[PDB]
Each structure stands twice: as C-alpha cells, then as structure tokens.
Paper text:
For this purpose, we solved the X-ray crystal structure of the complex between the Fc portion of a human IgG1 and unmutated FcγRI at 2.4 Å resolution. The crystals had C2 symmetry, with unit-cell parameters a = 134.7, b = 126.8, c = 71.8 Å, β = 118.4°, and diffracted to 2.4 Å resolution. The final refined model contains 5311 protein atoms, 321 carbohydrate atoms, three zinc ions (present in the crystallization solution) and 156 solvent molecules. The interface between Fc and FcγRI covers ∼1160 Å2 and involves both chains of Fc. FcγRI D2 was found to be solely responsible for the interaction with Fc, since no contacts within a distance cutoff up to 5 Å involving D1 and D3 were seen. In particular, the interface between FcγRI and Fc chain E constitutes a major interaction area. In addition, a very prominent ‘lock-and-key’ feature exists. The pocket is made of the hydrophobic amino acids Leu105, Trp106, Ala126, Trp127 and Val132 in FcγRI. No carbohydrate–carbohydrate or protein–carbohydrate inter­actions between Fc and FcγRI were observed. Therefore, Fc glycans play an important indirect role in this interaction, likely by maintaining a favorable Fc conformation or CH2 distance for engaging FcγRI.
Numbering used by the authors:
A (entry chain A): 24 to 44, 54 to 86, 91 to 218, 223 to 282
B (entry chain E): 232 to 446
C (entry chain J): 236 to 444
Amino acid sequence: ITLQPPWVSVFQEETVTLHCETQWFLNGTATQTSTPSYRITSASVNDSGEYRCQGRSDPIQLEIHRGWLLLQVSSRVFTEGEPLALRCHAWKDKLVYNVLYYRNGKAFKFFHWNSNLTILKTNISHNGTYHCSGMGKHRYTSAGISVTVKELFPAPVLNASVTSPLLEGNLVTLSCETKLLLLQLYFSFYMGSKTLRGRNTSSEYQILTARREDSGLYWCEAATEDGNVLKRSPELELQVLG
Amino acid sequence: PELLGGPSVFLFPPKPKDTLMISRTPEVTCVVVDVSHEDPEVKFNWYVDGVEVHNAKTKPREEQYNSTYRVVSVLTVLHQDWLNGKEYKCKVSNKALPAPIEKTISKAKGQPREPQVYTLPPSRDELTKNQVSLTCLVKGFYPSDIAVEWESNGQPENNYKTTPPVLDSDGSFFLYSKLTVDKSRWQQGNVFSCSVMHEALHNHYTQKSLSLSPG
Amino acid sequence: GGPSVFLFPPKPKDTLMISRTPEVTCVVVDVSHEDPEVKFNWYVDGVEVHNAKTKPREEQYNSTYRVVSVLTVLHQDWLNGKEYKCKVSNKALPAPIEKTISKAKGQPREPQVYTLPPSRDELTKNQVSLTCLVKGFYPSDIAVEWESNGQPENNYKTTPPVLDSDGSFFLYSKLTVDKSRWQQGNVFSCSVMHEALHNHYTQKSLSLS
Ligand SMILES: *[C@@H]1O[C@H](CO[C@H]2O[C@@H](C)[C@@H](O)[C@@H](O)[C@@H]2O)[C@@H](O[C@@H]2O[C@H](CO)[C@@H](O[C@@H]3O[C@H](CO[C@H]4O[C@H](CO)[C@@H](O)[C@H](O)[C@@H]4O[C@@H]4O[C@H](CO)[C@@H](O)[C@H](O)[C@H]4NC(C)=O)[C@@H](O)[C@H](O[C@H]4O[C@H](CO)[C@@H](O)[C@H](O)[C@@H]4O[C@@H]4O[C@H](CO)[C@@H](O)[C@H](O)[C@H]4NC(C)=O)[C@@H]3O)[C@H](O)[C@H]2NC(C)=O)[C@H](O)[C@H]1NC(C)=O
Ligand SMILES: *[C@@H]1O[C@H](CO[C@H]2O[C@@H](C)[C@@H](O)[C@@H](O)[C@@H]2O)[C@@H](O[C@@H]2O[C@H](CO)[C@@H](O[C@@H]3O[C@H](CO[C@H]4O[C@H](CO)[C@@H](O)[C@H](O)[C@@H]4O[C@@H]4O[C@H](CO)[C@@H](O)[C@H](O)[C@H]4NC(C)=O)[C@@H](O)[C@H](O[C@H]4O[C@H](CO)[C@@H](O)[C@H](O)[C@@H]4O[C@@H]4O[C@H](CO)[C@@H](O)[C@H](O)[C@H]4NC(C)=O)[C@@H]3O)[C@H](O)[C@H]2NC(C)=O)[C@H](O)[C@H]1NC(C)=O
Ligand SMILES: *[C@@H]1O[C@H](CO)[C@@H](O[C@@H]2O[C@H](CO)[C@@H](O)[C@H](O[C@H]3O[C@H](CO)[C@@H](O)[C@H](O)[C@@H]3O)[C@H]2NC(C)=O)[C@H](O)[C@H]1NC(C)=O
Ligand SMILES: *[C@@H]1O[C@H](CO)[C@@H](O[C@H]2O[C@H](CO)[C@@H](O)[C@H](O)[C@H]2NC(C)=O)[C@H](O)[C@H]1NC(C)=O
Ligand SMILES: *[C@@H]1O[C@H](CO)[C@@H](O[C@H]2O[C@H](CO)[C@@H](O)[C@H](O)[C@@H]2O)[C@H](O)[C@H]1NC(C)=O
Ligand SMILES: *[C@@H]1O[C@H](CO)[C@@H](O)[C@H](O)[C@H]1NC(C)=O
Ligand SMILES: *[C@@H]1O[C@H](CO)[C@@H](O)[C@H](O)[C@H]1NC(C)=O
Ligand SMILES: [Zn+2]
Ligand SMILES: [Zn+2]
Ligand SMILES: [Zn+2]
C-alpha cells in the first residue's frame, strides 16, 4: 500500500487515497472497494484504523485528527538509513509563520515561513516524539506523534586474534565485528588510510605471516549492499616485533 | 493566505461579594470574542462537576469596534456550591473552531485562612490637613477573594479605596483599605467601622471599629 | 517571517538616584539562525545618537535568536520627558520596526509619607506590622524600602499603586518584625523615592513611644 498525500495522519474532512501494489481490509474486516485504489474523499473518525490489501500487504495505520496544527509523517517506523519527511500542516491550509519543529520537547528547527522538513538519512538520534508549533492569529501547537528509528547494526569493532605486541611470522586474523538486527553486510579492511581488502561478504582478513612493516593502525567498514547505512570501526593499534 | 485562527474564550468567576452574602446572586460568565462574520453562530453547554445544567442565560451577539462579535453566557451558581469548590465548565462550539473549547473554573484550592483585621488611626503628621486617612489592615487571609467596606452610624461611607490583595511571604494575602474623611468628623469622636467579608470568617463577615478616644 | 520588538523603560530606582545609570532596553526576538545582522538606530527626541551598546545574538532554548540593544539615558533627559526611539532593521523584516518610549506624562505631584505603628490588637502576635502610607503622588513610578540601624530590612511587601479619587496614586508598605524588636524601642524607617520629592527622596521614622 502507498498513499496520495503520503501522510499517515490527516485532518477531518481532507482527502487521501490508498493504492495497492483487489480486496481492502480495515481493522481486520473486508470492505466493498474492489478498485486497486481506496478513496477517502472526506476523512471521518471511522476512517482511522489498520489498513491491508490484496499474497497480502503489511499494515498501515491511518489516523484522522482534529486541531489547529497537525505534524504529518510518512510512516511511524523506520530503519536506520531511511528518509523521514515531516510537515507542520495548518487546518484548512491556512497561514502560519515562525514555525518550530520539536523532538522530545526540544525545538530543533525554526522557519520564518511554514515549510516541510526532510531528514534524509535518519538514525537512532531521530527516534522520539515530534510536534510542531506556529503563529497564526495566535500561537498554535500540534499534538505529538511517535516516530521510531531502529538500529540496523551497531558500529563495527575491529578485533585481532593475537594481542598487539606480537612476533614475526605469526598468523593473525582481523575480524570486522558487528551483529545485524534483521540482505547481508559487506566489509572492507584498512591500514592507516590504505586499502587492504575491498568490499566483500567475508568479515575476516588474514595476515598469513606477520612482518615488522605490518605495524600500524587497522580499521574496517561494514556496509549494507545498497550502502545507505555505512559505518566504520575505530582504529586498533597493532605491532609486529622481530 | 489567511492566518489560521478562530474565537477565544475567557471564563470569569463571580464577584467576591456575591459569593459571600447569601442574599446575593453570584454568577460565572463565559465570554467569547473574535466570532467572525463568516461563522457567527455560537453554542454554549454548561457543566457543574461534569453534569450538564440548562439554566444559563445567553445574551445576544454584539459587534465590537474591530468587526468581530462578542457573545456572553451567564450561569448563576449556588452560594454553597461555589464555596464548597464545585467546578463550572463552559463549552463553546462554533464552526471556525476545529473542536469545542472547554474552560473550567472553581474557587482557588488550599486551606482557607482567617483574615486578621486591624484598624489604624491617622498619622499625627496628617492631622494638619483638612482631610485624614483611616486605615484598615487585613492580613493572613487565604484565598484572595475578599470584600471590604466602611460604615459609620449605620450608614455606608463612600470615600474609600482598597488595594488589591498582595501575596505575603507565608503564602497568605494582605491588603489595606483607606477611608478619607473630613478631619472635623474624626475630631468630633465619630465611630467608623471597617467591614470584611471572607470565606474563613464565621458567617463570612467581621467588623472592626476606630474612633478618636474621649476625654 | 517576522522578528518581534519590545522596548523597555528604565527601572524607576535608576532614574531617581543620580548615582545610578538608567537604561532603555530594545529586545528583538524570533531572529533566525539564517537572518543577517540585526541593526539598531536610536533616536532622542528625533535626533540620532551613536552610544547604544548592542549585544551579540544569543541562541535561546527554542533554537531562535535574541538580540538586545541598550541605550543609557541621562537623569535630566528622562525626567524632562524626552522620547527614546529604537529602530530595528533586518532582511527578515519588510519595513524597519520602530518603537518609542518616555516617562509617563502629566503634572508631577509630591507624595506625602506617613508611618503608622502596629495596632494594639496585633500586639498579642509574635510578629507585628509596621505600615508606611504613601499618598498623593503622580506619576505612579515609585520605589519604597525599609531600613533599621543602618541596614536594609528584608521582610516587607508593598502594594501596587492604586488610583485615588483625585487622579493621584497611593500605596501602603508593610514591614513585618518580631514583636520583641518593636517593644525594645528600635527605630525603623520607610524610605520613598519619587520624582517629585526634593531630590527624589524622603525618609520617615517609626518607633515605640
Ligand atoms: C476585538 O475587540 C474585542 C473587544 O476589544 C476591547 O479591547 C480594548 C482595546 C478596547 O477596544 C475595548 O473597547 C474593547 O472592549 C477584544 O476583546 C478582548 O480580547 C482580549 C484578548 O485579546 C481579552 O483579554 C483578556 O481579558 C481578561 C480580563 O478581562 C476582564 O477585564 C478587562 C479589563 O482588564 C475587561 O475589559 C473585560 O471585560 C473583563 O472584565 C471582567 O468581566 C467579567 C464578566 O463580565 C466581570 O465579572 C469582571 O469583574 C470584569 N473584570 C474587570 C476588571 O472589569 C484577562 O484575564 C485575559 O488574560 C488572560 O489570558 C491572556 C491571553 O490573552 C493572558 O496573556 C493573561 O495572562 C491571562 O492568562 C490567564 O491567566 C490565568 C491565571 O490568573 C489563567 O487562569 C488562565 O488560564 C490564563 N489564560 C491564558 C494564558 O490564556 C485577557 O487579557 C479582553 O477581555 C477582551 N475584551 C472584552 C470586552 O471581551 C478582541 O481581542 C479584539 N480582537 C482583535 C483581533 O482585535
Ligand atoms: C523563544 O524564546 C524566547 C524567550 O525565551 C523563553 O525561554 C522559555 C524557556 C520561557 O521561559 C520563556 O518565557 C522565555 O521568555 C521568546 O521570547 C519572548 O517572546 C515573547 C513574545 O513572543 C515576549 O513577550 C513579551 O513580554 C513582555 C514582557 O517582557 C518582560 O517580562 C517577562 C516576564 O513577564 C520577561 O521574561 C521578559 O524578559 C521581559 O523582562 C524585562 O526585561 C527587561 C530588559 O531585558 C528588564 O528591564 C525588565 O526589568 C524585565 N522585566 C521582568 C519582569 O523581568 C510583554 O510586555 C509583552 O506583552 C505586550 O505585548 C504583547 C505583544 O506580543 C501583547 O500580547 C501583550 O498584551 C502586551 O501588550 C502591551 O500592552 C501594554 C498595555 O498593558 C502596552 O503598553 C503595549 O504597547 C502593548 N504591546 C504592544 C502594543 O505591542 C510580550 O508578552 C517575551 O518578552 C520574550 N522573552 C524574552 C526573554 O525575550 C520567544 O517568543 C520564543 N519564540 C518562539 C517562536 O517560541
Ligand atoms: C477501526 O478502529 C479504529 C480504532 O482503532 C476506530 O476508531 C475509533 O472509533 C470511533 C470512531 O467512531 C471513536 O470512538 C474513536 O475515538 C474516540 O476516542 C476519544 C478519546 O481518545 C473519545 O473521547 C471519543 O468519544 C471517541 O469516541 C476512534 N479513534 C480511535 C483512534 O480510537 C475506527 O472507528 C474503526 N473503523 C471501522 C470501520 O471499524
Ligand atoms: C525510541 O522512541 C520511542 C518512541 O518515541 C520511545 O518510547 C517511548 O515509546 C512509547 C511510545 O510513545 C511509550 O510506550 C514509552 O513511554 C516510551 N518508551 C519506553 C520504553 O518506555 C523510546 O523511549 C525510544 N528508545 C530508544 C532506545 O531509542
Ligand atoms: C545521525 O545523522 C545526523 C544527521 O545527519 C547526524 O548529525 C550530524 O550532522 C550534522 C549536520 O546535519 C552535523 O552538524 C553534526 O556532525 C551532527 O552530529 C548524526 O551525527 C547522526 N547520529 C548518530 C548517533 O549516528
Ligand atoms: C461511525 O460509525 C459509528 C456507528 O457504527 C458511529 O460512531 C458514527 O455514526 C459513524 N460516524 C461517521 C462520521 O460515519
Ligand atoms: C515538501 O517539501 C519537500 C522538500 O522541499 C518537497 O520535496 C515537496 O514539494 C513537499 N512534499 C510534500 C509531500 O508535499
Ligand atoms: Zn570510508
Ligand atoms: Zn463557623
Ligand atoms: Zn534629579
């Protein structure tokens, strides 16, 4: 399911349409509409609920509201790396100015003229409750909404298999260590700013016979296939003695 | 291009004096302003501790200097209900509002405290003027709702002014009332009285006198 | 979008004591991070002056900025009724915003000041009230304090000015003190500062008997 107006939160009496990518399931029961598009011409309080369509689609929770201002988001649950579109929407599309966007009770952005806001690559710091406010004939404030941004994988740690003062001619394995939290990850190993081994599904890299000149600072990067989550490890100090 | 916004509502308590004399009729007043030409009609619902009552009196819309309407509704409240802390809720509906507006009002909360009432005669240095000031100090009282007046010989005195209540450091209130009188009347021995009405007096009324002593 | 401007008078006490430095304060709020410098021009009875001290923008908790400009005013200028105009210019404003301020106008009148002892009836309590009546003053700007034996007394409260029936203002000030301290004969004094007193001040004493 997709939405014209993207927003999962809409005012009473506004139009929104759902396209299915047929049968429509609202709150777990079937409705008439056979169309591949569901038309709410004038939203009412009974249009709030969980929507599904035809195997079968994930749920979408649609909220109909009343108020002066309504903070609109495109969904309520994100993975790290995804974009979050926000809008401070005035009832009957009237004018507000000097608008503020809030995260967890802290204003984080101010526009002289009402404007929507898109956080292009989200992450755990974006997780929280958002509201907006704005000046019309009086200062008006929206209800808060919950947004969720879930960590895909923590930042990797480079781990070596022998501790740092180590001897010539040893085997040592470096491991780029990170746990996915539900596609697989791609790893690359480095020494100073130089590349040791490039993008690969293997999370390990061997120095077969360590020599003195392998002494340096080693780190790694773990990236999703498409790469819109890419994270690096801190540097580990590794020494080979003669 | 039109700025967002509709009417506003202010909900006013009764006058202290109306709440304190059982022969008077205290009222709560719900006032709506910025009612537009576009959406003129306004509706009131009233609740006493959450129960709808129906005996409110609604006056007709009056157009103000700024081309918006003002609409007032008055609910009479029972003496004992007000003093016993019942909550009066005014609900205002109008098409320019996204949702009805609800305002609630009740007596201020906290343990009531008895006013201490002291009369102070005029300063010696004032007694060269043609008129003198008779002072009534009222302190230690809670809540701030109070009424003060002056009498002499059964008749009320009109030439007085009273400060508003002022928060003292112990969380109670005080005020002063000043009655101006011809010095001749003070000199002749006339008895003047400062009368105070407050919830925490017995019968909500006390009276203290003041006169130049004889002999 | 619209910064807003607020123009504040000096503290009455700063205007009535020649030792102090009274100031007018022009505050501009809702300036955005993007907005360029907020510019201030200041006028005294319509003549520009260049001795205003304008502060750097300061980010507020709501992520907007606030900018203050302070102009010292001279003792006789303020009391003679001169007008101070703050003019705020910025790209975020289509037209500059102007605000003017001066001393409240009307013929000054000198307060009379009277100290009243505590009532006999109050002398059963652990603390008693000493009263200072200040009446017949105009304009309403005023400061009242209490002292004893050379040091401020802190436990007092003063009503606001109230319009009397002749167009002048009055107020009362209440000093609360331990009963013992009153009966032991200590001298207290009520000090009033107001434009129309000679040198803008007077002091009246109060003690037992
Ligand atoms: C178009 O025209 C309308 C009429 O214009 C008037 O304005 C002047 C300039 C002149 O033109 C006159 O000819 C016109 O009458 C405008 O209507 C006015 O709108 C403003 C708001 O914009 C109202 O302001 C509120 O006023 C109350 C106090 O009002 C009483 O006292 C007034 C004198 O100060 C008096 O004029 C009023 O009639 C009213 O009188 C009382 O009436 C009752 C009932 O009859 C009597 O029983 C009383 O005894 C009597 N009192 C007296 C004295 O006579 C004030 O309380 C409001 O302040 C609250 O809200 C503010 C938000 O705006 C806030 O800033 C304040 O801090 C305060 O906040 C409250 O704080 C308390 C804590 O104590 C909380 O409990 C509250 O929750 C909290 N509320 C908050 C934060 O919101 C406010 O100042 C004004 O009353 C109104 N006039 C009339 C008349 O109806 C209109 O605005 C204008 N519109 C436009 C777009 O131009
Ligand atoms: C982002 O934050 C900014 C501030 O930080 C805030 O932090 C948060 C956490 C919270 O604590 C806030 O409270 C903090 O302020 C916001 O800035 C504020 O913005 C509002 C308006 O948008 C300003 O409101 C005005 O306030 C003045 C009174 O200001 C004094 O007193 C305040 C406390 O009561 C105090 O906080 C102020 O700092 C200021 O203090 C004075 O400061 C000076 C010098 O700096 C000293 O010399 C003084 O001693 C000192 N006094 C004290 C006490 O400390 C108020 O007067 C304004 O009201 C008039 O104008 C209104 C128009 O907006 C109107 O609605 C009112 O009815 C009133 O109208 C006037 O009526 C009289 C007649 O009665 C006429 O004489 C006037 O002509 C008429 N006005 C006209 C015609 O214009 C107004 O309420 C607020 O001051 C400002 N705070 C600071 C600090 O700068 C900012 O808003 C916020 N932005 C957003 C988008 O959220
Ligand atoms: C599908 O289910 C949703 C809820 O998940 C239904 O929405 C609710 O149903 C009715 C609308 O007629 C409302 O009772 C309810 O809103 C109530 O909530 C407030 C307090 O929160 C209460 O004070 C009101 O009186 C009001 O009754 C609706 N909204 C929500 C979020 O619960 C919806 O109707 C269902 N639709 C169908 C077709 O089954
Ligand atoms: C992430 O954000 C969520 C949602 O903002 C936070 O959860 C709050 O989540 C719920 C929805 O409002 C409420 O049930 C809770 O009051 C509160 N969460 C808990 C666990 O009590 C959550 O705190 C955030 N957590 C992290 C780790 O980022
Ligand atoms: C999540 O992403 C945000 C936004 O991209 C990161 O914020 C940094 O970027 C801003 C510019 O927008 C810059 O001022 C600072 O470098 C911010 O820290 C943020 O780092 C990132 N947070 C986490 C926990 O990964
Ligand atoms: C929604 O349905 C229920 C009754 O089944 C009721 O709340 C109301 O009549 C309906 N409201 C609308 C706008 O259809
Ligand atoms: C809101 O602003 C964004 C960023 O400028 C832009 O892509 C778009 O026109 C607007 N989005 C919606 C959903 O209206
Ligand atoms: Zn890199
Ligand atoms: Zn009793
Ligand atoms: Zn001088």
